[PDB]
Design an enzyme around this catalytic site. Structure first.
Site: not given
Lengths: 109, 230
Positions: B74, B72
């Site tokens: 940052y 996923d």
């Protein structure tokens, strides 16, 4: 003092880095088996567990190839330590979700 | 759910319509988007709404040559812009990306690297940089990992891979290799440990970018220029 600040002081003191250099933290998940030494990973303990992993970095840390880290498992502390250039992992703490395996947090002071 | 409305909301490039539209028929897609939109109202959600689907705008389905899977985005402001791994232009590459780029440079000593981390040039050249979770709560990693993007995104990738054989997949780390298992008789499936420095195997030694190029050549596809700078 936050754990991560204790870790930063231990590190910058151990390797004589600029104490006031801003550190940034990369936070990602990965399976304990793909990170920890084999001897620290057993079925029914750390094996197959997804750790939330925090890896600290800066310019002088990059220059050092030193990678300090703190690992968690569902908010249980799992590990504090650092990896070096040659991927020698050093640990100041290790808990296998069953019990404490290694607790040398007194080293941080 | 309505494609026109959906596309407008996310500024999705229409060339991805045929891979993505079928999703909107699925009730889980309706829950995902509702739950995403609810997060968006109750918390700071990253990356910015217009960026969640930036990967659609850099290239078309047909342009895609390589598929690189992320988990996923940052979760600190400024960092994510809708591609796996890549950061915005004036962000110093974090440990994982910096290792990706080191492998690139190892594979290609000649490669032009700016010391920057933004991967838009690869994206435009058909390097699909795709996270399996598209959003995150600011400050908390993997906070959206279970709202249902993985299914949605895995559908799109399945439809992409089905259109024609001979994609390269680069599957780095356990999550990616588990989530995405393409038919190795049909596509080139490249596997490695995660690029994070925490990995037992240093990623600097990953040769995927070279091996993928040798593969594309065998298929009449021009190799990727892995330069980060133009």
């Amino acid at each position: 003092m936050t754990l991560e600040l204790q870790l930063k002081h231990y590190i910058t003191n151990l390797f004589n880095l600029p104490k006031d250099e801003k550190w940034e933290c990369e936070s990602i998940e990965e399976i304990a088996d793909d990170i920890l030494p084999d001897q620290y990973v057993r079925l029914g303990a750390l094996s197959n567990k997804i750790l939330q992993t925090y890896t600290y970095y800066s310019d002088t840390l990059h220059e050092s190839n030193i990678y300090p880290f703190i690992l968690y498992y569902q908010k249980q502390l799992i590990a504090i330590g650092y990896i070096d250039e040659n991927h020698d992992m050093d640990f100041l703490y290790l808990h296998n979700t069953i019990m404490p395996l290694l607790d040398q947090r007194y080293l941080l002071t | 759910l309505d494609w026109t409305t959906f596309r407008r909301v996310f500024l999705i490039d229409d060339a991805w319509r045929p891979l993505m539209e079928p999703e909107l028929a699925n009730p889980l897609t309706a829950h995902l988007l509702a739950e995403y939109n609810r997060r968006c109202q109750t918390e700071e959600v990253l990356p910015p709404r217009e960026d969640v689907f930036s990967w659609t705008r850099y290239c078309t389905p047909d342009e895609v040559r390589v598929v690189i899977i992320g988990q996923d985005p940052y979760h600190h402001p400024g960092q994510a812009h809708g591609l796996a791994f890549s950061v915005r232009a004036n962000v110093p590459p974090p440990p994982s990306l910096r290792n990706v780029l080191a492998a690139v440079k190892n594979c290609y000593p000649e490669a032009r690297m700016s010391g920057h981390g933004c991967l838009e040039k690869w994206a435009r050249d058909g390097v699909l940089l795709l996270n399996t979770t598209l959003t995150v709560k600011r400050g908390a990693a993997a906070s959206h990992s279970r709202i249902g993007w993985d299914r949605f995104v895995g559908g799109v990738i399945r439809r992409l891979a089905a259109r024609r054989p001979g994609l390269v997949f680069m599957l780095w780390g356990t999550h990616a290799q588990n989530a995405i298992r393409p038919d190795p008789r049909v596509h080139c499936v490249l596997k490695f440990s995660h690029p994070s420095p925490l990995s037992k195997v240093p990623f600097g030694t990953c040769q995927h970018f070279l091996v993928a190029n040798r593969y594309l050549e065998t298929r009449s596809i021009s190799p990727i220029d892995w330069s980060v700078l133009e």
